[PDB]
Write a protein that binds this ligand. Structure first.
Ligand SMILES: *[C@@H]1O[C@H](CO)[C@@H](O)[C@H](O)[C@H]1NC(C)=O
Lengths: 48, 49
């Protein structure tokens, strides 16, 4: 009340959660190929 | 309580008071304030904001 204000962040928590889920799903489905370019599917045991 | 006349909350500023004539307790709140911002697409593109 003395001129002190708190500004809201640009990315809401739901958006950050969506980013995290996209990263994790890409990891478990394509391995490391989605970072270099287009995602390429591979069975999980073969990736391990 | 009957001997109390003011209220200071956590800081030193008064937030409650007792009306002398009618012995009523009144809460005090600050008037509205805030910043003002202007969204522009650039004077080159347009003059709307
Ligand atoms: C005068 O003030 C007293 C409290 O001090 C209140 O009880 C009384 O009603 C008031 N009288 C008038 C004239 O408003």
């Amino acid at each position: 009340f003395n001129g002190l204000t708190v500004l809201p962040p640009l990315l809401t928590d739901e958006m950050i959660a969506q980013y995290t889920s996209a990263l994790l799903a890409g990891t478990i489905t394509s391995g490391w190929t989605f970072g270099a370019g287009a995602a390429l599917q591979i069975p999980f045991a073969m990736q391990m | 309580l009957p001997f109390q006349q003011f209220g200071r909350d956590i800081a030193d500023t008064t937030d409650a008071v007792r009306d002398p004539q009618t012995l009523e307790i009144l809460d005090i709140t600050p008037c509205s304030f805030g910043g003002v911002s202007v969204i522009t697409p650039g004077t080159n593109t347009s003059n709307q904001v």
